[PDB]
Design a protein around this nucleic acid. Structure first.
Lengths: 88, 754, 48
RNA sequence: AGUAGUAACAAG
């Protein structure tokens, strides 16, 4: 089972954003899971590069901690354009 | 000496003075009270023309169904619905021969357009029957109430954006064992009143949820709303008209789009062509037939009228037409095109408000609704109604509706019915007889040109055409049709006499104050004059008098007489002050008590543009104030488009050129119903408006270009404002504190939307 | 094996029980069902 | 009464 694989290994956010971008390109995830994986991996890798890399008031690159509130760090170093709806 | 107005026709040919025969300064006829009498007439007549066909019970709705198609051929000259499939198919085959690849081309274009068509397309319709409230609402309202109600039954095909997945939900909804929908019910509060009855009933409508069974829903989805046609010209007696639901509109759109593609390429179609393009086409067709007349022979023109057109045409025939037209098409598209005719084949007519019974002695009146139509003995109805209801019985449903399988009461297949008419014209000859026929077809209107050796042989062709039409379910009116040697005829109220003559009277009611606003109405008024000079033979003397008449009407309508006039009025009091306070009075608009400077040469120039350089900079500053409170949220339609109502035809939109100013206002929505509190309905309207305005605040292009996306409005608005904020902070337009507040607020919004 | 080793997306328009039955009883006099109507129109030459 | 004209209004 291919569908069962992509469910367990990947995150719930990553799956949805992939299936929604596949729908925008008029492709069916439940019938063509070959594309579903490649988008999920490509999104995961994109999020790996962006994750926890922020910019402070002087414009310098620091990394945050999984726990620190979303009030402290407001400006990520990267803008993840991949995964967003076409028009956004 | 006694004047006789008909004596004009001694000195002037009737066509040359045809305008004088149109009494379009008179009041057009309006209906009063119920349309049930007229609707029941249609239900009875429609069944009278098919009664010799197959009668059976629908195993879906339990309705009484009549099928005249492939029925017995008529033995009289009464309206016949007994169309022979074979003859229809032979007519369409002969069209396919004369237009090779047209049927597949039309089917391809129509299919490709459908694959590109989005759900919002259905908002471009007029008044639509809303099955959720069992009343007529605008197309955009009926669509919304259907989409939102469909969500309560796990039907979210609308969210995909394309028409096809929405249309998939529409046919799939017929399978749902029960349908939950958003309806409206009103709370009654009995108040005191200064009248005979002594009291009052104040209603407060509120949004509710209502549940209906599958059969109940199917009946609603198949149902037509019926009312009487008001302000129709050239007719002594009123007639019933019908409005279809929102469900069928998507399917009809594609079938009409298919028929349009065919009609466009048919030499004898007067549809979808209109105005000057039609005139040229007809004039060419007349010149052809004149030159192609056998020498020593005669050419004759039938000024053609069809009778019971809609009553006799049959959805089952259109179902066959869609089938034969989409021959070489993908099964899905053939199946798509098949649905509109199938829904019409099983359509149910709502019978309106019912009949009113009264006591002249006790001075009492009561409305008997359609469900209760047989709750009283038929002796208590008048002779006409007693007869109607007796003939209605077999087609009557318990819930006050009627089964109406045959006929096309709603219309909506004007192009496809034209294709059928052009099919008949396309036959040209029967049995290799010594005549040829051709013509023009615009829906139920036709002109037939017949060429032969003598008029006796021409009449044989007309008789063969008459008979051929009966086989397609088309009934030529012998009462309203007439024939003569080619040179003159009438077609869709256009009059030919060695060329098309002007018919000024047809356009006369359109010269009045349109009733959009004082800005638009000025442009519209002047444009109508300009266009009637070009098209409808209005000379310079009449054109100039029209300018005067229009300004007279405008000044009295908008109470905006000349500042130097001594006319009493609340507006006039301030106009008189504005007149005194202003130096450049030539610059003042007619609506501001200013002078009229319009003449023939400048009819096409917006009034503000004409007067701009003559205006006082204080007046010009006020008039054109960019943030004035009279102009609301303007749509691209709002500025350019205006619905103009001709004497003859459907209500069409016309373009006008006007500068946006304080006169470009809009009247309050008709939320002024007696003893009704609309507070709930108004809040719903204001909620959608708030959401749409704020969306336009984030996306300024929305007003101009249609926004695209299957994602939430909120998701789009949040992402935009998040970027706005970040790039306002990193540019130094927004302060560090404001950015923190913004991103904090956006964090709460981000949570609410997931 | 699945990753290392593009189907044609045909347009989806399925007719349910109710609409199919409505179409079957929407046929001219002579036909048992719609399938019979579609075949006839497609296959027979109505010349003469 | 009257308007009107195949059905209404003459307030709710």
């Amino acid at each position: 089972s291919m569908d069962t694989f992509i469910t367990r290994n990947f995150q719930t956010t990553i799956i949805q954003k992939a299936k929604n971008t596949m729908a925008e390109f008029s492709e069916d995830p439940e019938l063509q899971p070959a594309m579903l994986f490649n988008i999920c991996v490509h999104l995961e890798v994109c999020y790996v590069i962006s994750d926890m890399n922020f910019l402070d008031e002087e414009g310098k690159a620091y990394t945050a901690l999984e726990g620190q509130g979303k009030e402290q760090n407001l400006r990520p170093q990267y803008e993840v354009i991949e995964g967003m709806p076409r028009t956004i | 000496m006694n004047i006789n107005p008909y004596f004009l026709f001694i000195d002037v040919p009737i066509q040359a003075a045809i305008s004088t025969t149109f009494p379009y300064t008179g009041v057009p006829p309006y209906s009063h009270g119920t349309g049930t009498g007229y609707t029941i007439d249609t239900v009875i007549r429609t069944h009278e023309y098919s009664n010799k066909g197959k009668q059976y019970i629908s195993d879906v709705t339990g309705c009484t169904m009549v099928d005249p198609t492939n029925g017995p051929l008529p033995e009289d000259n009464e309206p016949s619905a007994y169309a022979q499939l074979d003859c229809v198919l032979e007519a369409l085959d002969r069209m396919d021969e004369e237009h090779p690849g047209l049927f597949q081309a039309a089917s391809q274009n129509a299919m490709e357009t459908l694959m590109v068509t989005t759900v919002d397309k259905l908002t471009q319709g007029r008044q639509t029957f809303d099955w959720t409230v069992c009343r007529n609402q605008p197309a955009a309202t009926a669509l919304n109430t259907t989409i939102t109600s469909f969500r309560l039954n796990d039907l979210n095909g609308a969210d995909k954006g394309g028409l096809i997945p929405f249309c998939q939900d529409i046919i799939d909804s017929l399978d749902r064992p029960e349908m939950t929908f958003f309806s409206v019910k009103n709370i009654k509060k009995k108040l005191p009143a200064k009248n005979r009855k002594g009291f009052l009933i104040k209603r407060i409508p509120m949004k509710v949820k209502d549940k209906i069974t599958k059969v109940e829903y199917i009946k609603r989805a198949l149902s037509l709303n019926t009312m009487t046609k008001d302000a129709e010209r050239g007719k002594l007696k009123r007639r019933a008209i019908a409005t279809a639901g929102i469900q069928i509109r998507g399917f009809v759109l594609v079938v009409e789009n298919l028929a349009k593609n065919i009609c466009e390429n048919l030499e004898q179609s007067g549809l979808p062509v209109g105005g000057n393009e039609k005139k040229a086409k007809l004039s060419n067709a007349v010149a052809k037939m004149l030159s192609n007349c056998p020498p020593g022979g005669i050419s004759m023109t039938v000024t053609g009228d069809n009778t019971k057109w809609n009553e006799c045409l049959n959805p089952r025939i259109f179902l066959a037409m869609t089938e034969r037209i989409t021959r070489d098409s993908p099964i899905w598209f053939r199946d798509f095109c098949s649905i509109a005719p199938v829904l019409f084949s099983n359509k149910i007519a709502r019978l309106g408000k019912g009949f009113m019974i009264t006591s002249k002695t006790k001075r009492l009146k009561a409305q008997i609704p359609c469900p209760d139509l047989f709750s009283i003995p038929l002796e208590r109805y008048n002779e006409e109604t007693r007869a109607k209801l007796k003939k209605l019985k077999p087609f009557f449903n318990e819930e006050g509706t009627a089964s109406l399988s045959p006929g096309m009461m709603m219309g909506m297949f004007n192009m496809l019915s034209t294709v059928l008419g052009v099919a008949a014209l396309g036959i040209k000859n029967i049995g290799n007889k010594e005549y040829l026929w051709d013509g023009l077809q615009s829906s139920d209107d036709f002109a037939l040109f017949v060429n032969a050796k003598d008029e006796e042989t021409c009449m044989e062709g007309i008789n063969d055409f008459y008979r051929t039409c009966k086989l397609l379910g088309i009934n030529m009116s012998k009462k309203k049709s007439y024939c003569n040697e080619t040179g003159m005829f009438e077609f869709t109220s256009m009059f030919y006499r060695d060329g098309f003559v002007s018919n000024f009277a047809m356009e006369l009611p359109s010269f009045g104050v349109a009733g959009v606003n004082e800005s638009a109405d000025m442009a519209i008024g002047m444009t109508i004059i300009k266009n009637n000079m070009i098209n409808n033979g209005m000379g310079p003397a009449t054109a100039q008098t029209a300018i005067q008449l229009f300004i007279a009407d405008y000044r009295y309508t908008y109470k905006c007489h000349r500042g130097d006039s001594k006319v009493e009025g609340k507006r006039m009091k301030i106009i008189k002050e504005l007149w005194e306070n202003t130096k450049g009075r030539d610059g003042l608009l007619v609506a501001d008590g200013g002078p009229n400077i319009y003449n023939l040469r400048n009819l096409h120039i917006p009034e503000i543009v004409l007067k701009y350089n003559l205006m006082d900079p204080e007046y010009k500053g006020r008039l054109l104030h960019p943030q004035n409170p009279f102009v609301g949220h303007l749509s691209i339609e709002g500025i350019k488009e205006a619905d103009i109502t001709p004497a003859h035809g459907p209500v069409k939109k016309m373009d006008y050129d006007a500068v946006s100013g304080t006169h470009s206002w809009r009247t309050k929505r008709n939320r002024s119903i007696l003893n009704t509190d609309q507070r709930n309905m108004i809040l719903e309207e204001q909620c959608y408006a708030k959401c749409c305005n704020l969306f336009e605040a984030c996306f300024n292009s929305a007003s101009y270009r249609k926004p695209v996306g299957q994602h939430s409005m909120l998701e789009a608005m949040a992402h935009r404002l998040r970027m706005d904020a970040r790039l306002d902070y990193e540019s130094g337009r927004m302060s560090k504190d404001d950015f923190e507040k913004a991103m904090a607020h956006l964090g709460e919004i981000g949570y609410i939307g997931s | 094996q699945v990753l290392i080793g593009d189907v044609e997306k045909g347009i989806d328009f399925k007719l349910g029980q109710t609409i199919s039955r409505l179409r079957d009883i929407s046929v001219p006099a002579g036909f048992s069902n719609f399938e019979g109507m579609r075949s006839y129109i497609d296959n027979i030459d109505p010349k003469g």
